């Protein structure tokens, strides 16, 4: 069991982010931090596709268009950060964007409609719990893209390796997703 820098995976994404950024007419700023931290050849190879998902949404859905984005006083060029820091005995990766932000009450209104939870205990769940509703399958008939990137696939890889994904978000201030990994 042999460890190689997290550079191996991270370095692939910039080309993609640029690619994906250009498809939806959005200019983005991509920052990668902590490339030197190291994980086992296994742990690195798995997370790429999971990480790739989290990046895409930020460009795709996280970062606003210039005209609407320029209005709020935030700089016109959105910023996307992928970082890995070696803290303690756990390896944590984070992806953050200065984006629209996930509207937490939209997730709460979806859990009630679909019966995941009833409304009167909505007060029970914590903000941290609300976004976990992004992890139920099919939270997202006539038409079906035979090809589908789901959020859970990520939750799984993380859960696969004894690891915990998390989502923190603040409407119109941005969202950040975090992946803690052991050893
Ligand atoms: C109606 C909608 C959106 C659904 C589609 C199919 S949906 S399949 P999908 O894989 O896209 O669904 P996701 O499992 O990706 O969840 C995406 C859900 O989470 C939140 N969200 C996740 N990351 C976020 C981020 N960085 N910034 C802000 N919001 C984020 C989003 O507001 C969204 O509501 C298509 C593309 C046709 N379409 O126009």
UniProtKB/Swiss-Prot annotation:
Primary location class: cytoplasm
Keyword Transferase included in the entry's annotation: yes
GO cellular component, one term: cytoplasm
Cell compartment(s), UniProt: Cytoplasm
Coiled coil stretches, renumbered: none
GO BP annotations, alphabetical order: chemotaxis
Statement: the UniProt record of this protein carries the keyword Endoplasmic reticulum: no
UniProt domain Histidine kinase: residue ranges: 1-183
Molecular functions per Gene Ontology: ATP binding; phosphorelay sensor kinase activity; protein domain specific binding
UniProt keyword annotations, A-Z: ATP-binding, Chemotaxis, Cytoplasm, Kinase, Nucleotide-binding, Phosphoprotein, Transferase, Two-component regulatory system
Function (record text): Involved in the transmission of sensory signals from the chemoreceptors to the flagellar motors. CheA is autophosphorylated; it can transfer its phosphate group to either CheB or CheY.
Annotated protein name in UniProt: Chemotaxis protein CheA
Species in which this protein is naturally found: Thermotoga maritima (strain ATCC 43589 / DSM 3109 / JCM 10099 / NBRC 100826 / MSB8)
Organismal lineage: Bacteria, Thermotogati, Thermotogota, Thermotogae, Thermotogales
Gene coding for it: cheA
């Amino acid at each position: 069991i042999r460890m190689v820098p997290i550079s191996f995976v991270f370095n692939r994404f910039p080309r993609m982010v640029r690619d994906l950024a250009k498809k939806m007419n959005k200019e983005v700023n991509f920052i990668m931090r902590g490339e030197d931290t190291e994980l086992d050849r296994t742990f690195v190879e798995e997370i790429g596709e999971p990480l790739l998902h989290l990046l895409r949404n930020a460009i795709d859905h996280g970062i606003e268009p210039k005209e609407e984005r320029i209005a709020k006083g935030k700089p016109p060029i959105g910023t996307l950060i992928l970082s890995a820091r070696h803290e303690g005995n756990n390896v944590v990766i984070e992806v953050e964007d200065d984006g629209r932000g996930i509207d937490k009450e939209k997730i709460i209104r979806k859990a009630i409609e679909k019966g995941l939870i009833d409304e009167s205990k909505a007060a029970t769940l914590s903000d941290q719990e609300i976004l976990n509703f992004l992890f139920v399958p099919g939270f997202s008939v006539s038409e079906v893209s035979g090809r589908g990137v789901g959020m859970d696939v990520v939750k799984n890889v993380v859960e696969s390796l004894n690891g915990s994904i998390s989502i923190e978000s603040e409407k119109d201030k941005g969202t950040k997703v975090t992946i803690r990994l052991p050893l």
